[PDB]
A paper describes a structure:
The RecBCD complex of Escherichia coli plays a dual role in bacterial cell biology, acting both as a phage immunity hub and as the primary mechanism to initiate the recombinational repair of double-stranded DNA breaks (DSBs). The switch from the destructive to the recombinogenic mode is triggered during RecBCD translocation along DNA by recognition of a specific octameric ssDNA sequence called Chi (crossover hotspot instigator; 5′-GCTGGTGG-3′). Here, we present biochemical and structural analysis of two phage proteins, gp5.9 and Abc2, which target the DNA break resection complex RecBCD. These exemplify two contrasting mechanisms for control of DNA break repair in which the RecBCD complex is either inhibited or co-opted for the benefit of the invading phage.
We next solved cryoEM structures of the RecBCD-Abc2-PPI complex bound to a tailed DNA substrate. All of the particles within the dataset contained ordered density for RecBCD with additional density evident for the Abc2 protein. Focused classification with a mask around the phage binding site isolated 71% of the particles into a homogeneous class from which a 3.4 Å resolution structure of the RecBCD-Abc2-DNA complex was solved. From this class, a 3.8 Å resolution structure of RecBCD-Abc2-PPI-DNA complex was solved. The Abc2 protein adopts an extended alpha-helical structure and binds to the surface of the 'inactivated helicase domains' of RecC which play a key role in Chi recognition. Additionally, Abc2 binding displaces a helical bundle, residues 252–294, from the RecC surface and some partial density can be seen for the displaced region clamping back over the exposed face of Abc2. Abc2 is bound to RecC in close proximity to both a 'latch helix' which is thought to control conformational changes in response to Chi, and to an 'alternative exit channel' in the RecBCD complex which is thought to accommodate a ssDNA loop in the post-Chi state (i.e. the recombinogenic mode).
Numbering used by the authors:
A (entry chain C): 126 to 252, 294 to 1121
B (entry chain D): 2 to 60, 65 to 606
C (entry chain B): 149 to 345
D (entry chain B): 591 to 787
E (entry chain B): 886 to 911
The structure:
Amino acid sequence: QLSSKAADLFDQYLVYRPDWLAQWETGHLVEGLGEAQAWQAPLWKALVEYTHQLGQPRWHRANLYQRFIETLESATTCPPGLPSRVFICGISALPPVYLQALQALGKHIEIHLLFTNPCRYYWGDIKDVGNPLLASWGKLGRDYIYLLSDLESSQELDAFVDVTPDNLLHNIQSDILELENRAVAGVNIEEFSRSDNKRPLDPLDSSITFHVCHSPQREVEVLHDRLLAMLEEDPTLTPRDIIVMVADIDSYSPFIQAVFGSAPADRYLPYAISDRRARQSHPVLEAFISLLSLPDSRFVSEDVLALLDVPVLAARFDITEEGLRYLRQWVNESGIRWGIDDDNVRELELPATGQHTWRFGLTRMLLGYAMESAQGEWQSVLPYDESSGLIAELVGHLASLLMQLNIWRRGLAQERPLEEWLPVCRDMLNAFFLPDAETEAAMTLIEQQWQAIIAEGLGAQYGDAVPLSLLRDELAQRLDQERISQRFLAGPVNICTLMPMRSIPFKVVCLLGMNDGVYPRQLAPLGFDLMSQKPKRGDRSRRDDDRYLFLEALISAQQKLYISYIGRSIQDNSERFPSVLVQELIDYIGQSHYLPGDEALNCDESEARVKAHLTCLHTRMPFDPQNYQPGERQSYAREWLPAASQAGKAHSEFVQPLPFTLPETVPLETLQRFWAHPVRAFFQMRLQVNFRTEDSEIPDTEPFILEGLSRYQINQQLLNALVEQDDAERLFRRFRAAGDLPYGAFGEIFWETQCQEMQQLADRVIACRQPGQSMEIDLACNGVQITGWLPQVQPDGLLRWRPSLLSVAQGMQLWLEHLVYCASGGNGESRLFLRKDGEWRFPPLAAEQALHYLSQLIEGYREGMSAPLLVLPESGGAWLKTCYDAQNDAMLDDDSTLQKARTKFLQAYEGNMMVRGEGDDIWYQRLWRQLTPETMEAIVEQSQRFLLPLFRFNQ
Amino acid sequence: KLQKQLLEAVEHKQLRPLDVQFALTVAGDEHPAVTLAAALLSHDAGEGHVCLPLSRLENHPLLATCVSEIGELQNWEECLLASQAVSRGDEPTPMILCGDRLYLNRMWCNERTVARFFNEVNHAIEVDEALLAQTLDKLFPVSDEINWQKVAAAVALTRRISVISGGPGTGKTTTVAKLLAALIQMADGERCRIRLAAPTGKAAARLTESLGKALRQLPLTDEQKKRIPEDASTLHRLLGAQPGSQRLRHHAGNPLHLDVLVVDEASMIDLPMMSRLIDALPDHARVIFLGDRDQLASVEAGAVLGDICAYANAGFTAERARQLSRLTGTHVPAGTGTEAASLRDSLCLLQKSYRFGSDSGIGQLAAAINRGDKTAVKTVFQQDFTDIEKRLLQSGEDYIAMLEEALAGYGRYLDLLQARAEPDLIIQAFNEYQLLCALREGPFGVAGLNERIEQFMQQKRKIHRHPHSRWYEGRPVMIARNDSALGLFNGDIGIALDRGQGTRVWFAMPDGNIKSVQPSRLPEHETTWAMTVHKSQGSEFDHAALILPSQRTPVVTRELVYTAVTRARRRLSLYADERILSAAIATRTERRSGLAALFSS
Amino acid sequence: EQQLIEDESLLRYQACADFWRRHCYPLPREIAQVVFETWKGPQALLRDINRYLQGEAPVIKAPPPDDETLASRHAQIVARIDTVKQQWRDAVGELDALIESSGIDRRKFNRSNQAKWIDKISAWAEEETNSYQLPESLEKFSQRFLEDRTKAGGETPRHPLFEAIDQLLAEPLSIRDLVITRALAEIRETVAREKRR
Amino acid sequence: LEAQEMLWLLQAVMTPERENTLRSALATSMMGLNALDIETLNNDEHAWDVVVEEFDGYRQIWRKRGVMPMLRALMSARNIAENLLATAGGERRLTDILHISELLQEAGTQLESEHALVRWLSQHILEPDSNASSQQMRLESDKHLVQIVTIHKSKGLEYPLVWLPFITNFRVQEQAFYHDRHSFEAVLDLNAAPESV
Amino acid sequence: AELNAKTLQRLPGDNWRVTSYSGLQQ
DNA sequence: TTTTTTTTTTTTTCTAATGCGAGCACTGCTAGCAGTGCTCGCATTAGATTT
Ligand SMILES: [Mg+2]
């Protein structure tokens, strides 16, 4: 980076400062210069001599200038081969040395300089300039005209065109051209009182208009309507005449594109965006750049799948798009987290574990292809059962990719000389990529830029080795430096940034994003540059360039000038500010004009009134009715007209009574699935609406702790093993081989704690467990036949166990199974032993009461299929547990208990910060966005009616 | 080591990369003999073979190349079993060395499961001989000679597990209807839960329709007609196979709630699904299999129906012959010798085809191809048969003649199209002629043949086509996947036409009604001017035209040509070289499995 | 040319997980028990030191020696607990006679509670010192506890074992400070290095 | 929830062939259908076909003109904006919908594939980045709003009428991090010594 | 109050363009 | 080198602090017993910030 910066400095010195280099080559110092010269003068010298040792040509332009000028100065006749005449058009800035060379060259051949001069009279170092808008923004042109005037052998004729002040814009342009000042300061009291000194401004006049918007979206949306109005107003106007200039085109590109694309056919305006970053094939470039960083990468699964996203890299290993849907879940489930192999893990100085690496996952999938997981571990690795059929061929392709990813990640590590880096890019491209009609252009561009970098390096004869991190970071910077401006004047309206030395007259000139800080654009000098210490005339800087571009844009506008900027932030409703240029412009406008009828007002009041009349404050939203009121500010988009008119109807209540007829046969699984979640059942079963949320992303790192469904499944396996009195050590080895448990001793500690916690419940279950078999359920209730199967029906009763906390839903499921068992006819009690000594116990019941409660449940199911059954088994369960009294078999009424039950219901519904509440659910959000007390009362009533027998018969 | 050598085989497209990776990982750094053995085993298992006999490991060209590295081994068994990657089943290892063969650990378990299910699990169920004979006599009138359908019915009623093999148009569905009728009529008071399954949704719907229409004709009481199965399902839906995971709703612990099960088109049943189905059956369920042994083998690795029916050639057991003679009231021939009594008795073969007579050219050609005799095939071609045709296809000028003949083949359909007829007749007409090609792409293939036929219909005025539209009226399509919402299955054809309300695709549902679907509603589909022989299974066309490519590919085999021949109802045409057809018929498909040894020992 | 990142949460968590992998993984199961009791994993470990990671590092009062590893601290604490257990083992019988003879209010110190506490402390002392957990009854047998509850102007039971228990329970026994210091240094170093990279 | 509804909408538009995804997108609150509407629409084939057709046309618009044009056409045809403004509270809903649409356009410009945008949206829904400035929720309305502001963010500001509903509420600091009264240096005590506390 | 959006009497023209032989042939 | 299938859900913090209930030793009042002072144990409830 230091070499690059110093090279840029020396290039600038060559162009602008030849005397310095002439002195430095001899070895002397320039007097009265910057402090950094002490280390810059020798280096430059040490460069010249260096390039003489290699034998390269000595000549550079700095020494060549004087010899070139002296040759033509003393030449008696014209040298052969020179062109007849030259034109210099559109260039308002040249270095003084180029002007000296062209002056010396003018003798033999004629040179015509076309200089767009905004002012008629001599305005460079006038013998502050007369006009304020010219003095402020004319630094770039003052030096140029001062240089042009100093030419000895120059014959110049002035060809100006007078401007008639019939408009505000034409008034400003005439003030600039005639080099006169119109603003009234108001020094005299007589001058300050009357406002007649200013110029009359027509109210209908709209040549110059300033517009305040909220967001860039709103800004472009207002610009589109204003352009449509300008086109409709003037028949002679055409789209190509309009130009739209932005501070940074890449920031406004998506908004410009969306706004100008959303227009309907009758309202369509053709547009063309210029100077936008050239992005011919983004994904191939990005994939290759990522491939170059292989040695440093940790090879997270998501990163490799991001490489496989590229269709070319997948086609190379014949991995189809459909196979990627499989390889996603395979990578996720097998346990691949990070690291390509054990060696890569050790290279990062982290302890080699042997699990959760691409090698581990690949071995797991291959073993699962060979051996079923039911067999067991082979080399402390559990085979992955999923990839078992012909589809497993995908593995062979994936394992073929990683192998390559291995080889290259070892090849690119070592530093190499430049000439050894030449075949790397081509080999990598042809190995990793299979080209196509579209990608070939990008691949050729990649090879061309890589070859150009290495060619410059070899031409400089760089001996020492170069790391890949250098060439990668050079190629990345070189690939995005390209810009595509070939559609500048194609015919549609031109969208493009403000570029210096491009000043073309247009009828309509629009400027966007004039916020303070965005424009002008600031690029500070390097800080050790000697030019910026003692500047001279002709030195170029970005600030002066932008300040002069703003003047060029004003001068080139022939009919209408449009200026916009963000006034208030849409997010925070803060206050932004316009650029200092826009501020000086509006100040001069308001100080030089007065609206009709304000003659009596003083200078400041009429100035503020004019400034408020020209500045337009647009609404924050498009559907604001102010847009559609009749006037000049009226919009053209009729899509937001019904919204502004407030003519839409509100969303009716989602709940609607639907017809339903109970069939003759209802499977027991249907009732169970319904009562698990009655609202979700109406959504999924009645009208078949399923709200499938997106699956979870692959975890970043290997399991450190276990929580949620992971530890729930582990506890379920462990419990089902302990109740069978099976060996737990086998299950521990199996889980450790699968990689689910944490590494090493922590896995054993977790397993021991879980073993104790599950052993308590296993002892409780074994105390009552008896050998039982399943049975068939054929039943009749309320003219409806129920057919089902009940598993594990032992002579004692229905025994169930789950490693979960005590919840009402499980009690409801057990109650349904218990009612089915009793009504079917049996002598037994139902038990459920949940974690932390949770117990749901139901004593036996007679056939009649069983059928009665089952008929009640079926009626509830029918009502649910008709309209959504508002029964929240958790919150309503809390309310009913608070209100109900088991001793008296009656629910309490006193208002204190009611308040306590409401508090309990709200706590269960909303939930704490740590645990999500019952209310946070996709199905409940659909029915209501916010819980109302009336809905609460309805929920309480229904939940009480349906859940009363559970708490009544629970013991 | 041998890794660098195995890297070369992938370049020559002899060894899959999966095989190389599996060998490198599992075999590891053992003797290169073990690595090579593992690579060859993985290759053979990928190509469809179940096992790998050690005799095969004796000098694949890669083995000849690696003879130098592996050196000379006095016993391959010793070297292999020495490594950890190979065992005899005592400890879980990726590879298993059983007898003289090698197995993948997954394949060995499935093989053993199928073997023990077909040998020991099945039993002989006993019923009254007089009552069963009376029922069958009421079902089958002719007692003058041996009726193979009656023998098959007796077999399926006697044994728990039975398989019935026969060619297309041999009356399989009718026999199954008679069987199920006699079964229901036999058990009056006991509950009989009948289940019908097929490996494909299309075959499932065909089985529903055929079994329904067959059982409705046979005289039954309202009690019996209440036990008729409602619908037939797929094997996956039967076992409740989840889409993503391999977990089954009905595992070994949770058996199926069935009394009798009927699996149609067992030829497509592969070994893994066979084992997984076997695992979910209870001990009282009677299973019936249907399929043609000569039909093209299943997709995935394995061949069950073929390996089973291989023993049917031996014949019935001595005592079983007399038993069936006593049951059917006729004389049943006896197979000589005793090799495996259970398997030989559980198999029946239907040798009579009611559809096409023996004198018809199609049957003689199918028999000659099944026998593998090229001279017989050429003799059948030379004989004066009006329903078989052959055209030489070597030069493109013969390809153009084939296209000209396909023109006349689709003639009636094209005329009914340009005459603005109703979609019902158009669909009924479209199934009269069909092209069957082996490959998918290239000059001879669905992808190429569709484009060529469309260009030929654009050259001669038959059907107007728009380039941008892509949905010109008249184009036939076939569905790629199953769709439950629209009620249309994979492998079902439809005709795109404009009846006036809009361009819509018309399908023929099994109930005879026609259903119109919008082009947007349609799932993945493809133009069906020519079908592959694989996807043509189950279908039946009035005029079929087979196209075999000039080159030599492992796809063209004996069973493929056999299926393509049996595809046609009345008229069959072939387009192939004289030498290529003979070379294909001469080579029989083999998938090496230990079943041949297991059933004998 | 420098880049700006506003959120360093990912880099910080990755450095913490790297520290956990390097240090907590090799540990034997017995030190692993003590580490697991304090923090379940790197997520919980980052939660304690998140505030201290941001900004300037905080001076730690009484920092552990630079060479003290985790095993050294574990052995030191195990030795202290072993000494206390042995002193209890030797004086398991004299304490009853000492308490009965000396004058202390038995309303505050019930005989049944005393016997239960003695039994629990004996069972704990005979238990192998796998973990740093101490029974609550040791708080009852501390010299300060006995001195707090005694007859006005009466003999107070005093034994060297009581003074040892008082000295032991004076300060908690834990590896927390050492692990926190090591992590606070290593995670910061790692984050700075990765950001420089 | 508007993010999830927009995801469902895009997911249906991408593949209108699947009835489940289309029905899921239709039944969102954003569309505003009732239960009787969905019931009748699941039975009549013509209405379902018309919906499929309009979604297929939205897919064509989405392929040709980009993202924002498709969502704009959808809002216009379904009258989403008008109905949301009519419904009580729907103004915030519509603002969030517009904001998500702008973000989707910005992210779809860079991503060339149409499916990559759905992948990006699902990814962002899974792990929302609160620290992101662009993802900050915009102001609901430009009308008069009661400004709830934290005490730290109110430094140097000015407010005519001020409320402090919970000024009395406090917390006791458990952690031991202080400053030495002599050296004036930040001191963290990894031990819970009560002096530090 | 009554609200009405404006309409466009004169349609903008995209006749003007710059093309090569390839665009004309296409 | 050819290809078949299938749709559903599962979990939820931890530490701490108190209120009461049961048991017990002491002790004062009229040797036992009621009060009292105390203490341990189980269940119940509360709370966890700020650019
Ligand atoms: Mg201030």
